[PDB]
């Protein structure tokens, strides 16, 4: 009875009706309380991080990425941490060429912002994934070399 919506939606479990109401409440809280001030919004970031690993959808991924980056620019990094976990674990489970390009792009940005959370997640993807013949950004290769 006390199931959080994100827990219900992540069960083998997702319906549009439950997700619509949940997403709307989270976004409304982010708008009212402010970026980085809503713990409900944090549960939505976490939901996306896991849900997209098994049920990718382009528009949901794009919203996740956009809001995670907006939060991170203001200094609130949980969304982006969730996004890097999605990249590293999600692309290991099923490689996606377009999403991998985004993974490289956001890792480069994160490293150039003086963070290493993203770079470690990219390194981890390379250590765990069976993907071969990756076309890795030569600047990212330099960053990984020092890691
Ligand atoms: C199980 N893990 C762990 N991991 C990433 O790998 C990095 C190092 O964590 P770890 O591999 O769990 O350390 P590990 O040596 O296994 O733990 P321990 O030394 O206690 O035995 C973390 O950035 C973490 O997010 C992973 N990354 C991907 N893509 N897939 C995975 O299954 C895993």
Residue numbers in the entry: 794 to 805, 807 to 941
Give the published text.
Indeed, this dinucleotide binds the DM15 region in the cap- and C-binding pockets. Furthermore, these data provide a molecular mechanism by which LARP1 differentiates TOP mRNAs from all other cellular mRNAs, most of which have a purine in the +1 position.
Biochemical analyses reveal that LARP1 selectively prevents the binding of eIF4E to the m7Gppp cap to block the assembly of the eIF4F complex on TOP mRNAs.
